[PDB]
């Protein structure tokens, strides 16, 4: 094995590779969303900016897991990054709902990774996930839930000014 | 011919004179729009500011074509600047739709000028159009399309707050 | 069609979507390379930094094509991002040779896109490619060729100090 | 018991005392290494500086465990600090290999301490180890593995310039 490897289970290595792919997939979904709001028939620049930022953040998350894998003496194996489930995201409200679902899915994967690390008595990996991933996900989920709540109350998407004014006030 | 003239077709010279007139016409249309929004019964100051800026930009475009004509040793021949098609522009949404149409018309003229320059093997003129006109037009068209989309979604012109709030948030 | 669309062929739209995928693929290849040099048994930090920068640049290139597609009124359709051809890049010299090949492949695709835009009399798209893609690619190819030349002369990969000293002096 | 003591097992107290001794031992090993590279017949000043820094860091680690022991109401019991296994460390490469082994040994001890804290349901102690010790050790191990890899590739110790140039470029 690698000269640095210590207390690092093959299962954990495999699970980290899976998580890298999921974070890269999430980045790609956000990029798709960002583009949608940049269309001339949608034209919500602050929704576009918000989702592009999220795309860049999920990239960074993937890169930090790659750094971990090498720090522990595992080996990164990349897989195809699947295309997002859709090209047309329908509305600001629908995109925020889809983002909430995605973030909860990523959180579920991270909780399964923590359970594996706990089972394999790998405290460094448990601490890493907690320190850099789990509080970030809880914060993200709460922010997206707040956005969904506000858009729904305002009357989106049927009330035409709702997404416009949300774009200006909350996302601007 | 002029002592500076080289590789500059009489057709191209004539087409540049036509384009000068079209840019001056566009400036005048924008000025008309700007004034409309300054009326006491319309009273949308940021629409007025937006169209006055566009008027000044289209002037500048005309003046840059005049500079080109003299740089290449052509001769500027000015024509009457026709009055705009209307005095009353109806609404913020209607003015933005009319502006989009105008910008697409100007773009079409520039594409015809580029085709002529290409046919006449005039790379300096092709590059000039591309460098200073074609990307400017694509950007303008996309911005106006985004504005039209937003105003329509917000409910303009029948929803009375739509143009008011668009004036404040997007154009302010 | 889109309200902004003018002089934008369906073929060109499709070719831009293909190019977006190729740039995203290139970004992923560079990311794979970057990771490789971060392994404890490779341990060349400036090679890793160099390829991570290239990964981020190719992302940016993809995002600029997405912006173009929306500016012209085309519609972005994303596809799967295929995994790179390998996980183990063998040596600094081999990775630079593979990067040179990749950059030439991307250049070839851009030259085919320019030929299509020329055929379809789309000067804005021709100018865009030239302005933001073709000189960038020529510069990249020349830089990678210079790196390959230097590493080969120095004796890489068999001369053990060659990649070490190149990492320090050229990439540091 | 101490007036502050709460949820702090006698086993944990004993294990912390053991860890204090191990960190003091590691500091002493590093000091020995540092001195070696300061000899007139070895004369690698940046190797000497690197190991002296590591010596001072391992002191600090010991002192932080002493602070913990008193914060939790345990009592520090010091033991002899054994001399390092050798006086002559042979080469820069051999010292880095010996340091890697030592760091892995210290990590193993910390993982055993975390397992004990987990068994004894002592979350404050688990968190302390994770927060200040486990990520520090993973980082140290990866850095030493990278150094060993580079020195081996460069041809150390038989290639006479390898340690000289590594001292200048990596450690300088
Ligand atoms: Fe040197
Ligand atoms: Zn994430
Ligand atoms: Zn103009
Ligand atoms: Zn590129
Ligand atoms: Zn220590």
Author numbering:
A (entry chain K), B (entry chain O), C (entry chain A), D (entry chain B): 5 to 176
Which sentences from the paper describe this structure?
Thus, another dataset was collected with an ice-optimized apoferritin grid. 3804 images were collected on this grid at a dose rate of 15 detected eps. This resulted in 286,970 particles after classification that reconstructed to 1.66 Å resolution. The expected indications of high resolution were present in the reconstruction including holes in 6 and 5 membered rings, the observation of numerous water molecules and ions and the beginnings of indications of hydrogens. There is a presumed Zn2+ atom chelated between Glu23, Glu58, and His61. The ice-optimized map had clear evidence of the Zn2+ atom, similar to other high resolution cryo-EM apoferritin reconstructions, whereas it was absent in the earlier 15 detected eps map. In addition to the differences in the Zn2+ density, there were differences in the water molecules surrounding the Zn2+ and the density for chelating residues Glu23, Glu58, and His61 became more well defined indicating that they are better stabilized in the presence of the ion. In the presence of the ion, residues Glu23, Glu58, and His61 are stabilized and two waters fill out two of the three the remaining ligand positions leaving one remaining. There are no other observable changes in the peptide backbone. These data indicate that there is a network of interactions between the Zn2+ ion, surrounding waters, and side chains that rearrange based on the presence and absence of the ion.
The Apollo (Direct Electron LP, San Diego, CA USA) is a new high-performance direct detector that addresses these challenges by using a novel event-based MAPS detector custom designed for ultra-fast electron counting. We characterized the physical performance of the camera by measuring the noise power spectrum (NPS), modulation transfer function (MTF), and detective quantum efficiency (DQE). These results were extended by testing the performance of the camera for single particle cryo-EM by collecting data on two common test samples, the 481 kDa apoferritin and 149 kDa aldolase. Finally high-resolution apoferritin and aldolase datasets were collected and reconstructed to 1.66 Å and 2.24 Å respectively. Our results demonstrate that the Apollo camera performs well across a broad range of dose rates and is capable of capturing high quality data that produce high-resolution reconstructions for large and small single particle samples.
